[PDB]
Each structure stands twice: as C-alpha cells, then as structure tokens.
Ligand binder design. Structure first.
Ligand SMILES: Nc1ncnc2c1ncn2[C@@H]1O[C@H](COP(=O)(O)OP(=O)(O)OP(=O)(O)O)[C@@H](O)[C@H]1O
Ligand SMILES: Nc1ncnc2c1ncn2[C@@H]1O[C@H](COP(=O)(O)OP(=O)(O)OP(=O)(O)O)[C@@H](O)[C@H]1O
Ligand SMILES: N[C@@H](CCCCNC(=O)OCc1cccc(C2(C(F)(F)F)N=N2)c1)C(=O)O
Ligand SMILES: N[C@@H](CCCCNC(=O)OCc1cccc(C2(C(F)(F)F)N=N2)c1)C(=O)O
Ligand SMILES: [K+]
Ligand SMILES: [K+]
Ligand SMILES: [K+]
Ligand SMILES: [K+]
Ligand SMILES: [Mg+2]
Ligand SMILES: [Mg+2]
Ligand SMILES: [Mg+2]
Ligand SMILES: [Mg+2]
Ligand SMILES: [Mg+2]
Ligand SMILES: [Mg+2]
Lengths: 264, 264
C-alpha cells in the first residue's frame, strides 16, 4: 500500500533525525505511526525525567555565559520599538517584513538599533572598549521556508572603541562557533542597512551577518568610534546542532518540544 | 535656591534607593547632579568590571533553575498569538489592553493559553502529574503608573493531575518566594478569566494571581483534570528586591541598566 500526502506529513512530523526509518518501505502507515509515536513518547519522557530544559532557553543561557565571561555586558532591551527606528536605520519604504503595532511602534526585526543606543550611552560612563550583547525575540514577515521563521531569536554582540578590527571580529566569531562545535566559513555579502557584511555560513545556511564599522549610518545614531558587531539566529544554530530538516523544530512553538512533536 | 520640576526629575532619575541624599537640602542642583553622576558611573563601572549580568535575565535564569530542579518542564512558546485565544479565554470585548498585530494576531497579555495547550498535549505523553512553567515577555496597554509596564515579563508555573490542591499551590508559592527572600501574604481576589484567585501580595503590591482549578473555562481548552497555576511579574519581584520607587527601573529599557540611569 502507498501512503497519502497526509499520512507522509504525519510521519514526517513524528520522525526525528536520529531515526533510520524508511517511510516508503511498504510497511503500513499504522505500524510506522505506532513505532514513531512510541519513540517520541519515550524521548519526551526522558527529557521530563532527566533534563527539563528547553533548547532555546538553554542555548540562550549558554551563549549568555560565553559573552559575560568574555567581558560583554548583558542587555535586555525593548522588543516593541518605535517605527521611527526603522526609518533611521535606512530601511526605506525588509520594510515590507515589519510587523506594525498600533500607529508608531513595531516589533523589532533586529537588535541593532537598541544596541547602537546602548553603545552611545555607555561610552559616557564605561572604560574603552565598550562590549555588549543581547539575545532575544525578533520578528519579520517571511515567505516561509525551511530556514525562516516569523518569530525568531537573535544574538547580537558588538564592541566600540579599541580592538574593533576585522581580525578581532573574526576571532570572536571563531571562538564562539568553536564553543558551540559548529563548523563555518566566512563569505563576503552586502545588505541595505550596513553595506558589506561578513556572512558566517554553514554550508548554504547563513548563521550570521557581521559588520566592521564605521559606516555612514553611524552619524544618525550618535556613533562616532570604530565598532564591530554580528547578529546570529539561535534557531539556525539549533537547526545545525540537531540536524533538523525544518527550522520550525527549533522555534517557539506549541507543536514541537526540543524537536519532538507535541501531537502524540 | 529652589529646584525646578525639570531639575528634580533629573536628580530623581540619578538617585538610587541606597543613597541618603536630600534633594531639597539647599545645596545647588549642579553639585547634587555632579555627586549623583559620579556615584552612578562608579556603580555602572563596577557592574561592567565584576558582574555583567542584566537583572531581568539573571532573575529569569534563577527562577528557571528553581522550577527545573523541582520537576517542571521549561516552556518557550510564541509571544505573537492568535486573537482567537483572547476570545476563547473569556476576555469579552483587559480586552482593551490587548496590542493587536495585523488582523488575526496579538501580543500575548498572559502566558496561560499557551500553557493550557501544553498541559493538554503533554498529558498524552508524560506521567502524572504534568508540571510546566514559562518565563517571558507579555504585553498590556496600561494607564502607566509605578507598578504597571506595557512590556513586562511573566512567570507562570502550573501543574495538572494529582497534587493539584490549594495547599500544594500555596506551598510552591511559599517555597518560591522564600527562595527569593520576599515576604508576602495571600488574599482572596477575583478576576474575569479565572474567577476567584489567590492573590500573592507584598504590602499593597500584587506579585501574583493564582488559581486552583478546575474551572468551567477548562472545557474550551480541552483541560479535563484538576490543575493549579500562578502568574508572577518579574519586574515587580525586582521592584521589591531592589526597593525601586518606579517599576520602569526594572523594565526592558534603554533608559536604565540594573536600575542605574543610562543618561550619564
Ligand atoms: N526570518 C528569520 N528566521 C530565523 N532566523 C533569521 C531570520 N532572519 C534573520 N535570521 C537570523 O538573523 C541573522 C542576522 O539577520 P540578517 O538581517 O543578517 O538576516 P538575513 O541576511 O535577512 O538572513 P536571510 O538572508 O537568510 O534572510 C541571520 O544571519 C540569521 O541567522
Ligand atoms: N502591566 C503590568 N506590568 C507589570 N506586571 C504586570 C502587569 N500586569 C500584570 N503583571 C504581573 O503579572 C501577574 C499576573 O497577571 P494578572 O492578570 O494577575 O495581573 P493583574 O491582576 O491585572 O495585575 P494588576 O491588578 O496589578 O493590574 C500580576 O500579579 C503582576 O505581577
Ligand atoms: N543587525 C544586523 C546584524 C549585524 C549587526 C551590526 N550592528 C550591531 O552590531 O549593533 C551595534 C551597532 C553599533 C554601531 C552602530 C550601529 C548602527 C545602527 F544604527 F544601525 F544601529 N550603524 N549605526 C549598530 C542585522 O540583523 O541585519
Ligand atoms: N494567567 C493568569 C495567572 C494565573 C494562571 C492560571 N493559568 C495557568 O496557570 O495556566 C495553566 C492553565 C491550566 C488549565 C487551564 C487553563 C485555562 C485557560 F484556558 F485559561 F488557559 N482555564 N482553562 C490554564 C493571569 O495572568 O491573569
Ligand atoms: K530521520
Ligand atoms: K513561533
Ligand atoms: K534614595
Ligand atoms: K520596555
Ligand atoms: Mg532575510
Ligand atoms: Mg542574508
Ligand atoms: Mg544577513
Ligand atoms: Mg491589570
Ligand atoms: Mg490584580
Ligand atoms: Mg491578578
């Protein structure tokens, strides 16, 4: 017997990367589903008995320790931000990806503007160099695929003052991804907000865009020193680490817990 | 000389609870401001040199460890949720406090609906009792005062199955607030979504509303066992712990770092 599209979709929801199970072996849907339901219940029971930590929360904590231990100040800034920040970042009417809230506010699509404000303010009080980072939710309307979510989690680390060179930026990226055990390469790209970026790639998957300033946009933000920064998506890091086929396995979700279907 | 309203506001921004400084001692604004700027720069330099952790992030991590160690599964669910969830929770046209996003979605004003979904789903896979919790951003339009933010951080812990009694709920609340070192009392209140609540009070400040189910609303969420739950605002816990006069000191903000003005 042949499996319908609905049946294959249900098996794919229940399948995890570690399984070696052929969905098209000729065994009936009922037995494949029962086998995978049993495996997934066992997997969830093991998490509940022994770990209980959410992958996105746990990775945020691990990243936070890494940066705090390297001298970066942990930031938690607003997720709801002025729409004016979008304009001031050169996102001239990504502008179509912005979730608007009421009349003058939006959900932040990136962490950079709030971090630029912090760099400027902290430079009046703290010794050179200024090193800060933030992890938290960001939002973009996307044509949904296997690497994009509408609600995702960004890390951005940045530095202003001395030591803001391409080689230091690459060294921090390298130490960071070595800490996570993720192989990568650096390629040149370009984007509208920052211009040239160093994109951090795992295969064809973009883990990060990174920037060596100064750039002309700095004047609009009161930034007047050299700086470096990089933004990473946590769900993409999780996709690599766990070999997920689709990024939704990694997302904030009611449908998966640590990559395991919650429809059991 | 007398201080203007603008001058007093600036001094109040720079003043911290540990200071014993009279703003109305007759000393000129220039010297009071210079003294408090020096204290606040020193305080921020000490954080940067020795701790580097954000109060809201650090308290989320501490709470997460407390609940994970007590057998609760850590949840991270969507912040952008269907507007339909608002209706299904009996928030009939708090309904005025909802931030709408596009046409069918909103920013969650509480964690309860996503947690109700998780309790129902996990009960099909996990042993009794089901114990889960979430910490994260929630949003309400408020008439701004010293205890309300539009963007705040909720903890909700809940349990379904055995052990879902008033005395167990009170015992968890007690162990939790004892862990944080916060004195409290429990008073009866009532709200529209859940009916009678046990409100957890520190003086006149509401730290939490808590509920012993079942309640008639359960049927609309597929909940069909006894349950207990409580929601706490992290910024209110921080306000108590640090003796902040205004909750904005505790909030996600570009204007304060760990209660210290960033306008230095
Ligand atoms: N919609 C999304 N879902 C998940 N992660 C994202 C999304 N958009 C961006 N990111 C992550 O945030 C990082 C920094 O954001 P950036 O603006 O460079 O993304 P981007 O170049 O638009 O990504 P892409 O080209 O894949 O759309 C990205 O490298 C990626 O890891
Ligand atoms: N706007 C807000 N800002 C900060 N914390 C809040 C806010 N609204 C609710 N909380 C926190 O979330 C907890 C659970 O939410 P709940 O719906 O019980 O609040 P509430 O009863 O409306 O609070 P209040 O009566 O103070 O407005 C509250 O006890 C409080 O600690
Ligand atoms: N945000 C990217 C990822 C690369 C991150 C680079 N930005 C960053 O590191 O934050 C610090 C920052 C410092 C100094 C000036 C600026 C700035 C402004 F205004 F744009 F924020 N140029 N003036 C920003 C993405 O998601 O497209
Ligand atoms: N949310 C409160 C704080 C008190 C938290 C009580 N709720 C909670 O603990 O979550 C678990 C939950 C379990 C079982 C059913 C439900 C539910 C529904 F649909 F409302 F979610 N009643 N069916 C919820 C506030 O912020 O007003
Ligand atoms: K597989
Ligand atoms: K999501
Ligand atoms: K004081
Ligand atoms: K805020
Ligand atoms: Mg993109
Ligand atoms: Mg790109
Ligand atoms: Mg990019
Ligand atoms: Mg209220
Ligand atoms: Mg109340
Ligand atoms: Mg209440």
């Amino acid at each position: 017997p042949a499996l319908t599209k609905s049946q294959t979709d249900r098996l794919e929801v229940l399948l995890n990367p570690k399984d070696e199970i052929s969905l098209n072996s000729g065994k009936p849907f009922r037995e494949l589903e029962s086998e995978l339901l049993s495996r997934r219940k066992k997997d969830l029971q093991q998490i509940y008995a022994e770990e209980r930590e959410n992958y996105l929360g746990k990775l945020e904590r691990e990243i936070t320790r890494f940066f705090v231990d390297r001298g970066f100040l942990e930031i938690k800034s607003p997720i709801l931000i002025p729409l004016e920040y979008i304009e001031r970042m050169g996102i001239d009417n990504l502008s179509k990806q912005i979730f608007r809230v009421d009349k003058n506010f939006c959900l932040r699509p990136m962490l950079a503007p709030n971090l630029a404000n912090y760099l400027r303010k902290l430079d009046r009080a703290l010794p050179d160099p200024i090193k800060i980072f933030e992890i938290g939710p960001c939002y973009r309307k996307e044509s949904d695929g296997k690497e994009h979510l509408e609600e995702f989690t960004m890390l951005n680390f940045c530095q202003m003052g001395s030591g803001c060179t391409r080689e230091n930026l690459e060294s921090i990226i390298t130490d960071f991804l070595n800490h996570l055990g993720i192989d990568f390469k650096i390629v040149g790209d370009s984007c509208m907000v920052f211009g040239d970026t160093l994109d951090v790639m795992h295969g064809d998957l973009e883990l990060s865009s990174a920037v060596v300033g100064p750039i002309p946009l700095d004047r609009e933000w009161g930034i007047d020193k050299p700086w470096i920064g990089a933004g990473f998506g946590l769900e993409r890091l999780l996709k690599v680490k766990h070999d997920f086929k689709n990024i939704k396995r990694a997302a904030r979700s009611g449908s998966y817990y640590n990559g395991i279907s919650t429809n059991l």
